[PDB]
Each structure stands twice: as structure tokens, then as C-alpha cells.
Amino acid sequence: HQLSRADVTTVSTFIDLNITMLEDHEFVPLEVYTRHEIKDSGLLDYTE
Amino acid sequence: VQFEQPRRCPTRPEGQNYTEGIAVVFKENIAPYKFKATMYYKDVTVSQV
Ligand code: NA
Numbered sequence: 280h281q282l283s284r285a286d287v288t289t290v291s292t293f294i295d296l297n298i299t300m301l302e303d304h305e306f307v308p309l310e311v312y313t314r315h316e317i318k319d320s321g322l323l324d325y326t327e
Numbered sequence: 328v329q330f331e332q333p334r335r336c337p338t339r340p341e342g343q344n345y346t347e348g349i350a351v352v353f354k355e356n357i358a359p360y361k362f363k364a365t366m367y368y369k370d371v372t373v374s375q376v
Binding site for chain 1: 354357358359
């Protein structure tokens with residue numbers, strides 16, 4: 280008779296190692312207080 | 328001599344469990360409270376000439 284390799288049970292001598300790449304990441308600008316908020320926190324503005 | 332028998336292999340960590348959720352982050356308020364006012368006064372000028 281005749282067989283394909285898919286017709287034979289396959290065992291592996293290979294040791295698995297699943298390494299995945301660290302993904303791209305985007306850092307958006309972030310501020311707790313903008314400089315306009317810091318300017319506006321004063322009660323009276325001398326210039327205005 | 329004999330060969331060392333197979334060692335106990337390490338175990339992959341369980342992995343950090345994460346709770347999904349929605350959040351609102353609040354900061355200390357530094358903006359003054361603002362409102363609208365109306366001033367009624369009278370400019371009084373006395374000129375000695
Ligand atoms: Na041995």
C-alpha cells in the first residue's frame with residue numbers, strides 16, 4: 280500500500296519556544312495643568 | 328560516575344489578572360470660581376481752577 284506523511288502519526292523532537300515581539304506604543308502629550316491653567320489660578324492678573 | 332537526571336523545569340507565571348473598567352481621574356482644582364457681577368458707581372470730580 281502507499282501512505283502520505285499526513286497519514287502517519289507525528290511526534291516532535293523539537294522543543295517549543297514562543298517568542299513574540301513587543302508591540303509599538305504611542306505616548307500622547309499629557310499635562311496635569313496646562314501653563315494657561317497655571318496662569319489662570321491667580322486671583323488677580325496685574326496686566327489685565 | 329552517572330549522568331544527572333532531568334531537572335524540574337520552571338513554570339510560566341500565572342499572569343496578572345486584570346479587571347476591565349471605565350475611569351475618571353480628578354485633580355485638585357486650582358481654577359478660581361468665576362461668575363458675573365455688575366458695578367454701579369459714580370465718578371465724582373471736583374476741579375479747582
Ligand atoms: Na543517564
